[PDB]
Design a protein around this ligand. Structure first.
Ligand SMILES: Cc1cc2nc3c(=O)[nH]c(=O)nc-3n(C[C@H](O)[C@H](O)[C@H](O)COP(=O)(O)OP(=O)(O)OC[C@H]3O[C@@H](n4cnc5c(N)ncnc54)[C@H](O)[C@@H]3O)c2cc1C
Lengths: 666, 110, 133
């Protein structure tokens, strides 16, 4: 919508209702009259609207009260408390913006952030804007973490992050209004060519996609209704459920065949009993035909009572011949049915290898959106975040998405080439042990009051751990680490010197010959200035394709392009880059995914900080020291870049929740 | 959620009875009982009026009035039976004065 | 939430295929054996009906008599009345049969014959004797 309600929709907040977070901070307003609640909703959403109108400067709080409801002076400094509440938790004044009021020259508190990714950069600048000392420890020689961009001359290609999922409600729209981001829309037209290189007709492509959507509707009702979630004392995946359903449709075809032959043996037996009655009646008619001829040899007036006996046998014969004529009519009706339904049985409608190849492509596309095979996704919670999708079309970054983390790193104190070894947290402070990537013997020690960990979950699940925690994490925390998984996908950059595809088509698909290799080079992309194609590898083959050299992968990419457009129409590429996120020791995979046996509660458990025990026996409850962030710590928006962006804003908002005013002192 | 090309369509999901009921139930109630339906005192005064026009200064035995009431109600109930049959014969359900007049015409009561 | 158009999906079939490692193969083989069984039943019954059709070669064409097309009369003769009496005795209330036996009396005239000559011919006794057989 527009106005106050439109600003609430843009900030993921209900326009006519208060969230649970707004109830815990102001319990007096939500438990009071309804009119006071509406005033709080209006003040919040109006300041949201003022921020969304001008996100490039600091939305102050004195001009907000001055430009709200004429001279508005009927509140005892209530706008101050509400504005400071909203600006801290990242609901209003979200992202990184130029601040009018200067930062405090003396900072309060020291925080070490592990990893300079989107989450590590957002929470850092928020920590710094709040008046705290920040130092980022990055093991890579750059920032962004899982945000990679290949830049060489005029070729731009993103090896990890570039496309978004819309601007409606997404804080990325404000980031695009803040950081110079050229956004280009994605044309959803994606033609499909088989292994031979020829395209798929419209009627065939629409029927396989419709059957693919029908199998996803089977997925929905197997999950939310049949509760098919326990099999052999183990959680049920999805690839098994879909394959069973498909085999049941082949059973439905066989049953339709059997029932069709059952209806034929049924009518054929009716013809059997009908013909047997016709034979028996023909013999009786033949007998009566022999009888009355002897009665005709005598004159009718000669003997007596012949007119009764002759017409009686004549009427009975006439009645039986009339029935035989109607049974002959039914015989003709059954014969024309045995000529109409003989060569047209309603059968022979499976899925075949024709539709299976395209169905394997759709499965690979679904495996790409999750970076894991369908046999690892939980049937119950694989689309648990499917209700929080963003509105609008899908857009890309025309000039590489790395322009965001490089711009967010402006003014921060980031330690590049610094890998963290141990993480010590006690009741009086924290100590981070880190080394230099150029020489592992050089060790660095940083003191701080709190530590924010943005490391991927796949690193913590692997034993031995690459980063040790002292004291070790509790069993419930490590169990949530091991239950969840970490997906994998890769990209292959193909830099050419001339356009040799269809410029108006941004992406085209290539189906696989087999099911095991369905996620092997199934989709290429065109959406940058230079003629560049972006191949996609996913599934179980993705991990195997990483063990293969770059020349073979590019040779397979060229062989597919030559098989579709021709050998002469396909020149040789100039630069080729292949990504290996699983082989990357600083990622150990691609991005998060709901595994079988896990749920959305595990994302919230990753969001919960840990509190170390007291150093002195008998000391009170210490202050929570170690907090985590990243894409795998947010429940509603996992596996995205704004999810990690909101995680940094979340921990930024939890600063005041940790401080909780100055009431506990007196 | 990371579906940017050909998204997965699936995976998203006072009381008043009707006229005629009390009447029929009242019919059943009176067809089971045999109590007199016209009240005794207004009927007794009506008969006294009718008798005054025949002979003056007359006294009635209480049993004489009850016998007059018995024959009168039986005549009227039987007449309404014939009256209801006439109304149903005319493709109607409602009795009308033409039905009683037709019934008394067939009976020969002129 | 609801099975798709022309598609049945029950919990029993899902559990049967995933009963063990070779459950789907067992079900498919049993369905194929049932398909072979119904097909040979088609072949045997088709052979039986072909033989039955071979027995009906010629129809009842040599056993058909021409129609005695004659108008309906109006007078009842003694012969016609007695033929009606005997027709009631054997057929009863089959007016079409009695009309065809007499030949020159339509169905409506036979039905009228029952009423006009009911007592003079004891038709009630003739009908109750037919009902005894
Ligand atoms: C391949 C891929 C493509 C994507 N494409 C898109 C897209 O087109 N559009 C979109 O909207 N989203 C996309 N996403 C989603 C988005 O990029 C991520 O979900 C999100 O950015 C993750 O950010 P993060 O800070 O949590 O992870 P990271 O930023 O990776 O956090 C870890 C960071 O710290 C570094 N690090 C690792 N180990 C250490 C260590 N020991 N010490 C210090 N630093 C360390 C890493 O190098 C990394 O920079 C994509 C994700 C992936 C994986």
């Amino acid at each position: 919508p527009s106005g106050v309600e439109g600003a609430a929709f843009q900030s993921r907040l209900p326009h006519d209702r208060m969230t649970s977070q707004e109830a815990a901070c102001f319990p007096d307003i939500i438990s009071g009259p309804q009119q006071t609640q509406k005033v709080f909703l209006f003040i919040r959403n109006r300041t949201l609207q003022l921020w969304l109108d001008n996100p490039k400067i600091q939305l102050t709080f004195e001009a907000t009260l001055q430009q709200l409801e004429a001279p508005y002076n009927s509140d005892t400094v209530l706008v101050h408390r509400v504005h400071s509440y909203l600006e801290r938790h990242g609901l209003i004044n979200f992202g990184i913006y130029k601040r009018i009021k200067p930062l405090p020259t003396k900072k309060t508190g020291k925080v070490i952030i592990i990893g300079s990714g989107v989450s590590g950069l957002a929470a850092a600048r928020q920590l710094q804007s709040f008046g705290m000392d920040v130092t980022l420890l990055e093991a890579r020689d750059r920032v962004g973490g899982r945000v990679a961009t290949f830049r060489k001359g005029n070729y731009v290609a993103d090896l990890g992050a570039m496309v978004v999922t819309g601007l409606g409600g997404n804080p990325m729209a404000v980031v695009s209004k803040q950081v110079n981001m050229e956004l280009a829309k994605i044309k959803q037209k994606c033609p499909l060519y088989e292994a031979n290189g020829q395209a798929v007709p419209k009627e065939k492509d629409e029927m396989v996609e419709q059957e693919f959507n029908r199998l996803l509707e089977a997925t929905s009702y197997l999950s939310h209704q049949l509760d098919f979630n326990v099999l052999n004392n183990k959680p049920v995946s999805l690839g098994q459920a879909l394959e069973v359903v498909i085999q049941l449709q082949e059973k439905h075809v066989k049953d339709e065949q059997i029932e069709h032959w059952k209806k034929i043996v049924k009518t054929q037996e009716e013809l059997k009993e009908l013909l047997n009655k016709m034979v028996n009646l023909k013999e009786k008619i033949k007998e009566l035909h022999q009888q009355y001829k002897e009665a005709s040899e005598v004159k009718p007036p000669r003997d007596i009572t012949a007119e009764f006996l002759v017409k009686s046998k004549h009427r009975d014969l006439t009645a039986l011949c009339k029935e035989y004529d109607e049974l002959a009519e039914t015989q003709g009706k059954l014969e024309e049915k045995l000529q109409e339904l003989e060569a047209n049985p309603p059968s022979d409608v499976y899925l075949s290898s024709r539709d299976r190849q395209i169905l394997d492509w759709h499965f690979a596309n679904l495996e790409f959106a999750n970076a894991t095979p369908l046999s690892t996704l939980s049937l119950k919670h694989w689309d648990q975040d499917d209700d929080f999708e963003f509105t609008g079309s899908h857009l890309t970054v025309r000039n590489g998405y790395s322009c965001v983390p490089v711009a967010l790193a402006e003014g921060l104190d980031i330690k590049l080439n610094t890998a963290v070894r141990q993480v010590r947290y006690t009741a009086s402070g924290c100590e981070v042990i880190a080394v230099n990537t150029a020489s592992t013997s050089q060790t660095f020690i940083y003191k701080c009051d709190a530590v924010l960990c943005t490391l991927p979950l796949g690193v913590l699940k692997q034993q031995p751990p690459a980063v040790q925690f002292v004291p070790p994490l509790p069993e419930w925390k490590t169990s949530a680490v091991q239950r969840m998984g970490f997906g994998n996908l890769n990209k292959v950059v193909l830099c050419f010197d001339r356009v040799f595809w269809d410029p108006s088509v941004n992406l085209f698909g290539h189906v696989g010959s087999t099911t095991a290799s369905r996620g092997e080079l199934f989709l290429f992309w065109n959406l940058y200035k230079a003629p560049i194609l972006l191949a996609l590898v996913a599934g179980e083959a993705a991990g195997i394709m990483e063990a293969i050299s770059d020349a073979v992968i590019v040779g397979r990419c060229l062989a597919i392009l030559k098989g579709i457009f021709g050998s002469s129409a396909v020149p040789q590429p100039k630069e080729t880059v292949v990504s290996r996120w699983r082989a990357d020791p600083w990622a150990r995979g691609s991005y998060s995914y709901v595994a079988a046996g896990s749920s959305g509660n595990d994302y919230d458990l990753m969001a919960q900080p840990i509190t170390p025990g007291p150093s002195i026996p008998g000391a009170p409850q210490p202050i929570p020291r170690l907090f985590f962030a990243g894409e795998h710590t947010i429940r509603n928006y996992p596996a995205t870049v704004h999810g990690a962006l909101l995680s940094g804003l979340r921990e930024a908002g939890r600063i005041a929740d940790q401080f909780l005013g100055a009431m506990y002192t007196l | 959620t990371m579906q940017t090309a050909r998204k997965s369509t699936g995976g998203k999901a006072p009381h008043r009875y009707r006229p005629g009921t009390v009447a029929l139930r009242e019919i059943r109630r009176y067809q089971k009982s045999t109590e007199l339906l016209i009240r005794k005192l207004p009927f007794q005064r009506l008969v006294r009026e009718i008798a005054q026009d025949f002979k003056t200064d007359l006294r009635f035995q209480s049993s004489a009035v009850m016998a007059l009431q018995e024959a009168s109600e039986a005549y009227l109930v039987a007449l309404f039976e014939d009256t209801n049959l006439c109304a149903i014969h005319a493709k109607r359900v409602t009795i009308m004065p033409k039905d009683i007049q037709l019934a008394r015409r067939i009976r020969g009561e002129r | 939430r609801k099975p798709p158009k022309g598609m049945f999906l029950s919990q029993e079939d899902v559990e049967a295929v995933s009963a063990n490692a070779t459950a789907a193969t067992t079900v498919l083989r049993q369905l194929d054996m049932e398909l072979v069984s119904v097909k040979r039943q088609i072949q045997n019954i088709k052979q039986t009906n072909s033989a039955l059709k071979e027995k009906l070669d010629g129809g009842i064409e040599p056993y058909r008599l021409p129609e005695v097309i004659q108008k309906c009369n109006a007078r009842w003769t003694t012969e016609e009345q007695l033929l009606a009496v005997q027709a009631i005795r054997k057929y009863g209330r089959d007016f079409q049969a009695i009309s065809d036996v007499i030949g020159n009396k339509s169905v409506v005239q036979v039905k009228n014959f029952f009423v006009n000559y009911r007592r003079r011919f004891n038709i009630d006794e003739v009908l109750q004797e037919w009902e005894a057989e």
